[PDB]
């Protein structure tokens, strides 16, 4: 199911994904059209006792699902212009498995959220954090250039 849902999340079939996981849990959870509630509600059934080996296991997949889905929900809501729904899902990225390149991108994403809300000093927090933890400091310096443009700090913008 984990693997099926990984295919449908790479190929943008989020309605059928929901339907599958609704069927998996009690279908009483039918109105819960949020995925990021169903994916948490979805319980892998065993500790995976002495069976054949595996390169991965139900939880080790579910924990990648929650973070990838929440990250994607966040970026869609940002570009679509709801940087009020974004912050919930972009903190749900960091509260669970988050390889550090996933966290750098979550932080640039929150810099964007706050700049669009009109809180440039909070955006600066998350972009400094992304600079520190990242070996990839393109997307933060770009967010900074856009921030100094928004304020007027043109010398700082051109330096960024």
């Amino acid at each position: 199911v984990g693997l099926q849902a990984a295919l449908w999340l790479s190929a943008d079939r989020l309605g059928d994904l929901a339907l599958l996981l609704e069927t998996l849990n009690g279908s009483q959870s039918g109105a819960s059209k949020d995925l990021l509630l169903l994916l948490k509600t979805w319980s892998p059934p065993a500790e995976e006792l002495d069976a054949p080996l595996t390169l991965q296991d139900a939880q080790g997949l579910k924990d990648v699902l929650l973070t990838a889905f929440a990250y994607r929900q966040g970026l869609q809501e940002l570009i679509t212009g709801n940087p009020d729904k974004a912050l919930s899902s972009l903190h749900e990225a960091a509260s669970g498995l988050c390889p550090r390149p996933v966290l750098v991108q979550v932080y640039t994403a929150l810099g964007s959220c706050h700049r669009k809300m009109g809180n440039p000093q909070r955006a600066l927090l998350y972009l400094v954090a992304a600079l520190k933890e990242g070996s990839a400091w393109g997307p933060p310096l770009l967010e900074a250039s856009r921030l100094y443009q928004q304020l007027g700090d043109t010398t700082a913008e051109l330096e960024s």
């Binding site: 960091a94 509260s95 669970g96 498995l97 988050c98 390889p99 550090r100 966290l103």
Partner: protein
């Protein structure tokens, strides 16, 4: 037994202030312990509600401190290991 708390300052190299105090006296017997009353006997005394009994287990036990660094992840799995795998109150 009687109980003697001794205190020595470290900053003053005169050894000036070697105060003490007698903090009291413990009576103990077999007629006490035969009626429980001071023991910790596990699982019956699960619900920990006299904090002396917590402080006794944080005394008696072999303590060991570990640093955990996850250097290419974030580390949140702990609370789950604690609450779900280890089934912590």
């Amino acid at each position: 037994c009687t109980v003697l708390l001794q205190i020595m300052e470290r900053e003053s190299g005169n050894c000036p202030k070697d105060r003490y105090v007698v903090c009291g006296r413990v009576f103990l017997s077999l007629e006490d312990l035969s009626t429980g009353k001071y023991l910790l006997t596990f699982p019956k005394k699960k619900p920990i509600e006299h904090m002396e009994d917590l402080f006794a287990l944080l005394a008696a036990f072999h303590k060991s401190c570990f640093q955990i660094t996850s250097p290419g992840y974030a580390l949140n799995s702990m609370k789950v290991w604690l609450l779900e795998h280890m089934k912590c109150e």
